[PDB]
Structure 1
Amino acid sequence: GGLTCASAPQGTLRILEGPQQSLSGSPLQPIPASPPPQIPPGLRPRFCAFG
């Protein structure tokens, strides 16, 4: 138990978690565009001129 000074280390291992990327890199999934306003069907001339 003299606890002498040992030599300098050769290198460094570093352990850390890696993320999973099987999900991302996929084609994007955007929010679907709301439709442009379309005229309602069944619009008729309700007003007829008097006389």
Structure 2
Amino acid sequence: GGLTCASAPQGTLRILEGPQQSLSGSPLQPIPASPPPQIPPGLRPRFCAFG
């Protein structure tokens, strides 16, 4: 029950949970481009010149 002292420890192993692999996909997923505005189909002159 004396509990004598011991020598100096050489190395200290650190145990830790691993990096989060297979979380990010190898291609990227962007928000798609909002489309450029279209001229709508079915546009015709509705105004006739009077008389």
TM-score over 0.5 for the pair: yes
Runs of 4+ in 1 over 6 A off after TM superposition: none
Instruction: Give the alignment's Cα RMSD to 1 decimal.
Output: 1.2
Number of equivalences: 51
Distance apart, 1:4 and its partner CA: 0.9
Q: Which consecutive residues of structure 1, in runs of 5 or more, have no partner in the other structure?
A: none
What's the CA shift string for 1:20-46, capped at 9, x where partnerless? Answer: 222325100000111011110000000
Using the aligned pairs only, state the percent identity.
100
Q: Which consecutive residues of structure 2, in runs of 5 or more, have no partner in the other structure?
A: none
TM-score by length of 2: 0.88
